[PDB]
Amino acid sequence: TIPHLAIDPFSLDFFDDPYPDQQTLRDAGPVVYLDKWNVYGVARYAEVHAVLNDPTTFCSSRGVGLSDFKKEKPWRPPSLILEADPPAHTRPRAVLSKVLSPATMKTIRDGFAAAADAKVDELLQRGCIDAIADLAEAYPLSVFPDAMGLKQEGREHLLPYAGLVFNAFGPPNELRQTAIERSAPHQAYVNEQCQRPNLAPGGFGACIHAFTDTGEITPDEAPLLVRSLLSAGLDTTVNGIGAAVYCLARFPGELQRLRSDPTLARNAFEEAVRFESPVQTFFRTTTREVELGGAVIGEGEKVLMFLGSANRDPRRWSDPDLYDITRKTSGHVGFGSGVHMCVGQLVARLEGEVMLSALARKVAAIDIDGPVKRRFNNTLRGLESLPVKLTPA
């Protein structure tokens, strides 16, 4: 009764243009079986949301990539937060939620905004720039390593390490194999910066280590939670900001609306997260036989959630393939949903907001003026190169 499809959602052709295949996945049924990788798939909003919100049945501790940690050794020691289930998940999550809290956002917002304004001013002096290297990468690199408390030396490891982490959630294709082949120097740098003496006072890493005397985490858990932020906290924002700039470049009417009301910056970023869904996919593993969308899935089965597809599902969204900066975006799953819903989302939204505010106040037009090149990753969707001309306001 479950339809079987040969679509490979980790193939370069799929990454190059996922939208037709995502409609095929949605319209085939609420639950599909992907014969290429022997996993179940859910691509509609309803089933993605249901799976996210039943962590008991659809667990994370057997891994949120294709690999099942009950069958294979994880490529690195499991994350204490992303790859943990309640109750072990709960207190590390609470620590990261306090480290990346509103009060923290209040302490960093002015500096993050000043850096965003400064970057757009610098880019306007050049006029023609690459909105990936020169903006989507450069701006997070200018604020997030410092906010972590990292030293200057070795920061060139951070984007390659993150690319490895996000490729490693994928199946054992060439993208994953090559990433792991090149991993040893990046893992070495990252594991070393996770130690308490290497994290500057007041930054996110030091604050994690400071929580090790409350009973929520022990000192030996703090380095792995720092590792979580060094895995996730930079490349996600690169692709979120890149998505927002790409949306504004393709939809100039929405850039004009944003210029006319810069307080739409935060929602324009949120809509870009829905529209592009930089984090495309995550897996769960069933802990029992379960009925989902009328289908019966056995115990110990991997279930692939298409977050980007759920965010384009016309069963949930009006005009899903339109970028609309005043859309009611609440409920999109681009940050997940439920107990694992992105604990760094306030950092992501802060960066995206202040960059889009800088653009709204300083830029009159964003025109693609060179070849667009896509970046291929088993989990992240985004561009390698986005040549644009920025016209000043």
Residue closest to Cl ion (Cβ): 187
Contact pick of 222, 342, 366, 388 for ligand PQP (by CB under 6 A): 342
By a kind-dependent CB cut-off of 5 to 8 A, residue 187 interacts, out of ligand PQP, ligand HEM, Cl ion, none, with Cl ion
Q: How far is the CB of 126 from ligand HEM (least distance, A)?
A: 26
Which stretch of DSSP H or E encloses residue 286?
strand 281-286
Q: How far is the CB of 229 from ligand PQP (least distance, A)?
A: 8
Q: For residue 388, report the phi and psi dihedrals to the nearest 5 degrees.
A: -135, 150
Q: How far is the CB of 238 from ligand PQP (least distance, A)?
A: 12
Q: What is 6-39 written as a DSSP string?
A: ---TTSHHHHH--HHHHHHHHHH-SSEEETTTTE
SS3 382: strand
Contact pick of 22, 67, 193, 236 for ligand PQP (by CB under 6 A): 236
238 token code pair: 């690169």
Q: How far is the CB of 75 from Cl ion (least distance, A)?
A: 9
CB 219 within 8 A of CB 212: yes
d(CA 393, CA 255): 12
Residue 380 buriedness (CB in 10 A; 0-12 / 13-18 / 19+): buried
Measured between alpha carbons, how far is residue 206 from residues 99, 149, 257, 310, 346 in Å?
A: 9, 7, 41, 37, 19
Question: Any contact of residue 382 with ligand HEM (CB under 6 A)?
Answer: no
Q: How far is the CB of 153 from ligand HEM (least distance, A)?
A: 22
126 is in an annotated binding site: no
Q: How far is the CB of 345 from ligand PQP (least distance, A)?
A: 9
End-to-end Cα separation, the chain, in angstroms: 58
Question: Any contact of residue 304 with ligand PQP (CB under 6 A)?
Answer: no
Q: Which residues bind Cl ion (CB under 5 A)?
A: 76, 187, 190
Which stretch of DSSP H or E encloses residue 227?
helix 222-232
Contact pick of 32, 39, 66, 81 for ligand PQP (by CB under 6 A): 81
CB 78 within 8 A of CB 224: no
Point out which span in 77-85, 248-256, 314-322, 365-373 binds ligand PQP (CB under 6 A). Answer: 77-85
By a kind-dependent CB cut-off of 5 to 8 A, residue 165 interacts, out of ligand HEM, Cl ion, ligand PQP, none, with ligand PQP
d(CA 28, CA 115): 46
Enumerate binding residues for ligand HEM (CB under 6 A). Answer: 60, 64, 81-82, 93, 96, 100, 228-229, 232-233, 236-237, 240, 273, 278-279, 282, 307, 334-336, 340, 342-344, 347-348
Enumerate binding residues for ligand PQP (CB under 6 A). Answer: 79, 81-82, 165, 227-228, 231-232, 236, 279, 342
Residues annotated in the binding site, as ranges?
89, 93, 284, 340, 342
